[PDB]
Write a new protein. Structure first.
Length: 98
């Protein structure tokens, strides 16, 4: 994680037979949408850029900063084959909630 920056970053993922290759938690109370799980060999893993503890801020221009979990899952499912994710790495906040 030496190369993950503090600020939001852009990551392009291509959907496959196991979706985008990650699952999400949060979207409630003080907790935004966080990646909780990255599937080995799936797209997010292959890319090598996303991490457990990333907050998802936007998906293809759909703002998820204040989305509920279901709003985020719908946005992710409907974002098409090529998906641009704006993510911000917040491992301490992730651990606080999860």
């Amino acid at each position: 994680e030496e190369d993950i920056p503090r600020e939001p970053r852009r990551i392009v993922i291509h959907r496959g037979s196991t979706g985008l290759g990650f699952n999400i938690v949060g979207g409630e109370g003080g907790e935004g949408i966080f990646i909780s799980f990255i599937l080995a060999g799936g797209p997010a893993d292959l890319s090598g850029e996303l991490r457990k503890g990333d907050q998802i801020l936007s998906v293809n221009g759909v703002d998820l900063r204040n989305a509920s979990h279901e709003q985020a899952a719908i946005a992710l499912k409907n974002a098409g084959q090529t998906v641009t994710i704006i993510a911000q790495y917040k491992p301490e906040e992730y651990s606080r909630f999860e």
